[PDB]
Write a protein that binds this ligand. Structure first.
Ligand SMILES: [Zn+2]
Ligand SMILES: [Zn+2]
Ligand SMILES: [Zn+2]
Ligand SMILES: [Zn+2]
Lengths: 111, 235, 124, 199, 199, 199, 159, 161
RNA sequence: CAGAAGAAGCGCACCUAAUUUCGAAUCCAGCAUGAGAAGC
């Protein structure tokens, strides 16, 4: 604790017991031209939502534009090769619906 | 709100020890080369500094921010592209009385189906635009008997009148729908007769209700209203 | 907000819509453990860091008292904890002290047990 | 009259909730699709009447205690004007001192209203004899109201909270005998000055 | 009046239990994954209808005794308003004196609801012709309800207890002839005051 | 009607028994222990389907006898509603008079369920080609189920005992061709008044 | 020809087009395929529905005692006497019809349209007071207009 | 003004001919066009394709369609649940309706079973298969026709769908 | 810095997870009070 307070870092020991951080979502799109269709005040909008540290910011194409001008193991087989191989092994009954089910189950846990 | 002045206003609330521009206490928000040491002099390095300078102070391991209803996103697979984490999403912002929801195309498709079902089921053919025969007394007799036993009720007479205002054809549609014996359940939409009976008798009173209401649609509106107003005084 | 319960150690992080639990475990009195387990309340998730009894030992006791809906951990931490909980129950029964949970609590703890790897973002 | 008691009331549903639609056009339009519509605002929010529930609660509780409370509720009964329920809720002379707002949801019908299937089952055959659909309000739905007592007496918040416990125990509205309407209340009582707005 | 009976009813589930989802949105959401969803609250607890089971129980037993009771199981059958079942659970003239709550589980759906595979076997080739998935409540899961009887009478707890025994024998919910829904009921009754909340 | 036939059936296994687990979570929890888990309750007791073997037994022998009977085993079949098996066990609108409880054991899994090594042997090398581990219920295990028949008819006990003789010679559960499932049923039937719980 | 009677003010701009979802009624004419809104159809539904629908004896000294009693136990009121006097001025027949309407006990609920007596009355005394109100006002039917006005003017001074 | 809606399904309310409708007033260069939901689905695919980029149905006549749907409704193949779910997939787009009718008609390669409801009555296996193919062809021909005429065809067999 | 108690191998696969009926009916929609006061 003494060494990390020496690194200017606040530390709360468990023999003791405060700011309110709150991540917010910013529209950043102008909600003037807005109608009511089915008793809901709605607007179809095209945008590029961004997740910034501490803030989710919905952002119009103006955003992508500015950021566009600013900016600008496992083996390998083609997509059609994968579909053709799983098609053949499905009709040769090596790959089954249960094997594909558990491969999807383990792939949903990570790679 | 404990406020202290320095050569700097050090307001110390319970929501953070704010300081607009170095005290010896813990400082949470710094509302701010010469600039870097001032932050280095503060013990318990601040959570956020509200300011080229930002690039450097980010690399000094410090958070920055550079200067209504709650907005809730309902749409979530993003991508690294152009540095910032990001996704393409087209959607709909909706402005509720206490919130702003960010919905997608499935919500609008849902409310499109929910509105289209309301739209398509409001006008039913010739609204406000081969019937059997019965004497007026026989109509009075059968509607009175089927009002005493609970087949032709006040709600049935009311809903007869509302559809018969919308034309003869809508009234025939309503009467055919009420008399319809569903082949999967063997049941008509007539309210069942009160009093001890038998299924042949009950089916014949249902048939009597069908023929007496159908023989009333051929009559004039005023004559229909003056037959039914003796039973349901509203309509 | 985060509560530091810890006998047993645990980290309840009440978000405001859930009660997420970190490392319910006991390295070493059974009654004060049970009272301290009752002090947590119904938790939505019990996240396990590692498969040591200092951070996983009380997980079957939490499914005895039905205080946890899902026990997420790493797929190797789970398999480890199979052997870990049967060994802890072997030692506890073998010592002739009254078992703190049972083998059925072990089984049912692995009935609601999900498993994810590193760098896999869950949303619950 | 210098003070005003504001009781902010926050009601969370511990059960399905139903309160029927009273508006004839809206009821008919919804009865083309669901036989028992729930009461709804034009802003798509759920509205329970709240003054009658509180008044009925206080009338049965205060009649049980043995107090001088009449029975509004009997057919065209006249409030006497001398009870405590006539003071807090009104008589033919003076109005009620407590303005009881409707219990309006903070959520919209898409989020809290579900169409549900209810049955009548024949006893001997044990099969479905009748089927109907009814709109209900989900569990955990949060509703708000603000009771505003003008000329506040000292036993006014206690009676409101007692009525809130009675509404918790009997249910707020709708099919209360079937299990619907079981709720819980949170009471943010306060005492504001009447000249709060005059700056 | 002046007292209210409170029957605190605790179900322990002995065989598995199924009561299907009634809400169209929740059912249509779950029929993607499971062909027989279970009734569930929005706070993820299991919901069993209890007033109709207690009604139906008492109608069968009192019609078998020969005491006069109406039938409210027949299609669109008007309640008589004179029988003891009409006094306890309701008629069209007077409301039900017994306000039966919903049987709500003490535990969450991810702790007592399991998804199960059911079949239809061809009687001749002894081979699965149909496979469906249904959600069931596990055995030993505990449900709670309050039967809150206003205007108490002497034979209104015993008939309820009698009806509970019938629900112990026949079952509650759905799939009652395949063995689903055999349950045990434990009863705790108290004559609470009607003015108990008045402080 | 006025009576109800309660048939208490005690079944003793005369060979190993396998009824496979239907719950998803119980199978996925046991997939690293036993490849064929036994259907057990959450009270750790073995749960066997009983309605469906009785129906299949009665349908096969009544089809063999030539008496009119439909097949509720063919895929997405609709029970005719007129045959006797539609009377006892049910149709789509009339429901089963014979409420057939599950065969819950009298003991726990630790006493009756054992984990076993089953094999597939090559016919030309006489070698273990596949080894797979499955649970089974031991011999002598006692299971109990109560069949409660409402509206009792004359040929309802006799048909059920005939069906139980069919399950005695054919088997209950899974792996029936290998020798698994051979049992002995013992029946004590009694007619109880439907108003027996009134007091 | 096409006329849009729907208000064109509120319009979002998605996909670089000014689009707005509407739910209305496309309506035919001699040459005008007009898009008319929800309100227009509420106009024509109300218009068409409204168009298709629009097309004994007792003593006077005992009578004074009865109307006093029934005005003091609140069965007879100022409003009842007012509508009784209007129906009397529209005829004898319609006033008997109004008295019948008010006294009519509905078989479904057992409720008459009088005002309930206040006071500790049981069932059949309230029923006898309703019968008393029936026979008192229906005995007042046969009397001449001046005498009915002088009888009612003691109780409702406006009429 | 340029209506992009076929002006059919027009009832006669009193002395008025009209059509219940929901669409979009897409005000453009001088058109102020009235385009339906299909245009909005195209527009949504336009946007949700363009924005990502920065990172043979048979003809069967209408009366034969009512005749076949009626025959299949009385022999318990096109039940009310099938008409309801077909309507829910039809309102979700025509491609989802092709996917649904393909899923229901797909004879599973292992079991040999289609997902229709079995015919009630005496029919041979070849006859049952021809009825299943009739169900596929009739609903696949119903996918082409517009939303209003499909609502009129399906409302005479399922009154609530 | 946390648990620990005559050989050998194996302890795995596959299918199916759909279908259908019902979604109505009924009662009620009244009553009461106040019709004045005051300035220019
Ligand atoms: Zn460790
Ligand atoms: Zn009073
Ligand atoms: Zn009754
Ligand atoms: Zn049959």
């Amino acid at each position: 604790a003494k060494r990390i307070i020496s690194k200017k870092i606040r530390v709360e020991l468990p023999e003791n017991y405060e700011i309110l951080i709150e991540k917010k979502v910013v529209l950043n799109i102008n909600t003037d031209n807005m109608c009511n269709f089915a008793s809901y005040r709605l607007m179809p909008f095209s945008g590029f939502i961004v997740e910034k540290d501490d803030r989710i910011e919905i952002n119009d194409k103006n955003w992508f534009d500015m950021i566009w001008n600013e900016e600008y193991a496992l083996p390998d087989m083609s997509h059609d090769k994968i579909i053709e191989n799983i098609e053949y092994l499905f009709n040769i009954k090596i790959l089954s619906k249960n094997r594909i089910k558990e491969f999807w189950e383990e792939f949903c846990k990570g790679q | 709100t404990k406020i202290t002045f320095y050569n700097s206003v050090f307001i110390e609330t319970h929501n953070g020890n704010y300081l607009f521009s170095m005290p010896d206490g813990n400082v949470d928000y710094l509302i701010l080369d010469e600039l870097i040491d001032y932050i280095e002099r503060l013990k318990y390095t601040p959570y956020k500094v509200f300011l080229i300078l930002a690039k450097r102070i980010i690399s000094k391991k410090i958070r920055v921010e550079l200067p209504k209803k709650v907005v809730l996103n309902i749409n979530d697979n993003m991508c690294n592209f152009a540095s910032y984490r990001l996704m393409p999403f087209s959607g709909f912002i909706v402005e509720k009385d206490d919130r702003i929801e960010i919905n997608d195309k499935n919500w609008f498709d849902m409310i499109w189906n929910e509105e289209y079902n309301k739209m398509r089921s409001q006008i039913v053919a010739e609204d406000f635009s081969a019937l059997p025969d019965m004497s007026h007394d026989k109509i009075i007799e059968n509607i009175e008997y089927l009002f005493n036993i609970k087949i032709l009720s006040k709600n049935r007479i009311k809903e007869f009148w509302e559809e018969f205002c919308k034309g003869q054809k809508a009234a025939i549609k309503y009467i055919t729908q009420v008399h319809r014996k569903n082949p999967n359940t063997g049941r008509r939409n007539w309210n069942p007769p009160e009093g001890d009976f038998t299924d042949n008798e009950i089916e014949k009173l249902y048939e009597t209700a069908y023929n007496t209401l159908l023989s009333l649609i051929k009559y004039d509106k005023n004559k229909v209203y003056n037959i039914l107003i003796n039973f349901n005084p509203k309509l | 907000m985060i509560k530091f319960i810890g006998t047993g150690s645990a980290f309840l992080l009440e978000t405001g819509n859930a009660k997420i639990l970190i490392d319910c475990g006991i390295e070493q009195n059974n009654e004060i453990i049970e009272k301290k387990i009752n002090e947590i309340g119904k938790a939505d998730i019990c996240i396990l860091t590692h498969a040591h009894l200092a951070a996983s030992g009380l997980v079957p006791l939490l499914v005895k008292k039905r205080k946890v809906n899902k026990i997420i951990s790493t797929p190797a931490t789970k398999e480890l904890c199979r052997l870990l909980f049967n060994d802890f129950q072997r030692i506890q029964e073998e010592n002739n002290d009254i078992p703190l949970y049972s083998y059925d609590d072990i089984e049912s703890s692995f009935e609601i047990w999900d498993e994810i790897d590193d760098r896999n973002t869950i949303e619950l | 009259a210098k003070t005003m008691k504001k009781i902010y009331v926050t009601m969370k549903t511990l059960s399905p909730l139903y309160t029927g639609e009273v508006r004839r056009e809206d009821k008919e339009a919804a009865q083309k699709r669901v036989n028992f519509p729930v009461r709804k605002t034009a802003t798509n929010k759920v509205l329970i009447p709240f003054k009658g529930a509180l008044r009925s609660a206080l009338e049965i509780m205060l009649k049980a205690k043995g107090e001088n409370v009449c029975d509004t509720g009997e057919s065209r009964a006249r409030p006497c004007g001398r009870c405590v329920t006539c003071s807090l809720f009104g008589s033919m002379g003076r109005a009620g001192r407590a303005s009881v707002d409707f219990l309006i949801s903070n959520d919209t019908k898409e989020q809290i209203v579900r169409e549900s299937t209810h049955l009548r089952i024949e006893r001997q055959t044990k099969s479905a004899s009748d089927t109907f659909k009814g709109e209900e309000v989900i569990e955990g739905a949060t509703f708000t109201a603000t009771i505003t007592i003008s000329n506040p007496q000292e036993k006014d918040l206690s009676l409101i909270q007692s009525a809130l416990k009675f509404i918790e125990e009997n249910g707020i509205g709708g099919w209360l005998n079937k299990g619907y309407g079981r709720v819980s209340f949170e009471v943010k009582s306060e005492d504001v000055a009447t000249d709060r707005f005059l700056k």
